[PDB]
């Protein structure tokens, strides 16, 4: 048989980044040529494993951690980088073995009046674990008075939405985001 | 909110000088805080923001001299300048940057931080 | 690296006009352009954010021009006004500055 990547690559919505979907597989072998051959990947750079010796090692299983981010945020999805998106949202380690693609998705995520459908984590008292998600949703304290789970001024709630627009530039275009791990 | 920050003064160059915003009803150690310095007769220059995690980030010319941290337990917020040179010479505000629409909220008030 | 532009500088003071800040940026910033009111001898009082929303003042625009209105001048706003913008790569930009 074959991985599935069609299904993850091709799909027609992938997750926002605080909430960043993760398929486990498993159970059969995988062509990374496809995934290496494509002229709509803008981004293929990756760690420990040589995108040509891709099909020469088999390993327990595979991770396919998908989501979207800003275009301009991509940067930090890469081992030991910092960023919003790295420190609150998706944060990689350092000895990261398997690694990221990311096409512009601009027609298919940004629509007129604001797509949002797209969240990410804004504000966190602690920096996350590696390969580690939250989805508290709690209203974030961010001054010293008590506010009870009321937004307003110095409680600001921790999402918020990118706001996806056609005419943006590339830099604040959505960019799909897949990022592979392996064993 | 009356974050008031202190500690400016004069050092020879290339000495080390601290600086420290002391916020009032606000907690460092959750909002994102920063350093903005306005050199005499010119306009705003960014220095270093730290964030909710305690990432900082520090501007080209202060990188590799500049540290940012706070300290949670007196909710005070340091600038430990080193290697002084003749154009860090300036006012020292320290902000409160909003991981929003990003822009500094509530600003302190000016510490002299002066080199001769 | 963004480069910002504040035209025109040092406005006249002329009470009780329609007064007209414009701020080109040399790239598209969608709506992260932020106003700044220092005073002399104060710090900066943040006057809009996002461009548009208040925090008598009225900003517009997006992408290249952004424009800060102030559609009645009062004697206490003889003041200097700052853009601003932050990179994803962390690293906020002031603009030069105007004086009114």
């Known amino acids: 048989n074959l991985c599935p990547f069609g299904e993850v690559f091709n799909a027609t919505r992938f997750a926002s980044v605080y909430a960043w979907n993760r398929k486990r597989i498993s159970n059969c072998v995988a062509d990374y040529s496809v995934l290496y051959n494509s002229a709509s990947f803008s981004t293929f750079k990756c760690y420990g494993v040589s995108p040509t010796k891709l099909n020469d090692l088999c390993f327990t299983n595979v991770y396919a951690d998908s989501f979207v981010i800003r275009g301009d945020e991509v940067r930090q999805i890469a081992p030991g980088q910092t960023g919003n998106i790295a420190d609150y949202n998706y944060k990689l380690p350092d000895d990261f073995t398997g690694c990221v693609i990311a096409w512009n998705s601009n027609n298919l995520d940004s629509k007129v009046g604001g797509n949002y459908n797209y969240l990410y984590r804004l504000f966190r008292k602690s920096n996350l674990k590696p390969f580690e998600r939250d989805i508290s949703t709690e209203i974030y304290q961010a001054g010293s008075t008590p506010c009870n789970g009321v937004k307003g001024f110095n409680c600001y709630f921790p999402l918020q939405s990118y706001g996806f627009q056609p005419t943006y530039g590339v830099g604040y275009q959505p960019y799909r985001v897949v990022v592979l791990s392996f064993e | 909110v009356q974050l008031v920050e202190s500690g400016g003064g004069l050092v020879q160059p290339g000495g080390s000088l601290r600086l420290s915003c002391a916020a009032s009803?606000?907690?460092?150690?959750?909002?994102?805080m920063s350093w903005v310095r306005q050199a005499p007769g010119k306009g705003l220059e960014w220095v270093s923001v730290?964030?909710?995690?305690?990432?900082?980030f520090y501007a080209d010319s202060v990188k590799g001299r500049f540290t940012i941290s706070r300290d949670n337990s007196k909710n005070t917020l340091y600038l430990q300048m080193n290697s002084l040179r003749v154009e860090d010479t300036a006012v020292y505000f320290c902000?409160?940057?909003?991981?929003?629409?990003?822009?500094?909220?509530?600003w302190g008030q000016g510490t002299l931080v002066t080199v001769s | 690296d963004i480069q910002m532009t504040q035209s025109p500088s040092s406005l006249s003071a002329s009470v009780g006009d329609r007064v007209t800040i414009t701020c080109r940026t040399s790239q598209s910033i969608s709506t992260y352009l932020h106003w700044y009111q220092q005073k002399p001898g104060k710090a900066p009082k943040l006057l809009i954010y996002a461009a548009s929303s208040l925090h008598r003042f009225s900003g517009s625009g997006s992408g290249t021009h952004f424009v800060l209105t102030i559609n009645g001048l009062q004697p206490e706003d003889f003041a200097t006004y700052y853009c601003?913008?932050?990179?994803?790569?962390?690293?906020?930009?002031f603009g030069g500055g105007t004086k009114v």
């Open positions: 730290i964030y909710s995690g305690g990432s900082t």
């Open positions: 601003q913008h932050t990179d994803t790569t962390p690293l906020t930009f």
């Open positions: 009803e606000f907690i460092v150690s959750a909002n994102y």
């Open positions: 902000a409160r940057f909003l991981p929003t629409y990003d822009y500094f909220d509530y």
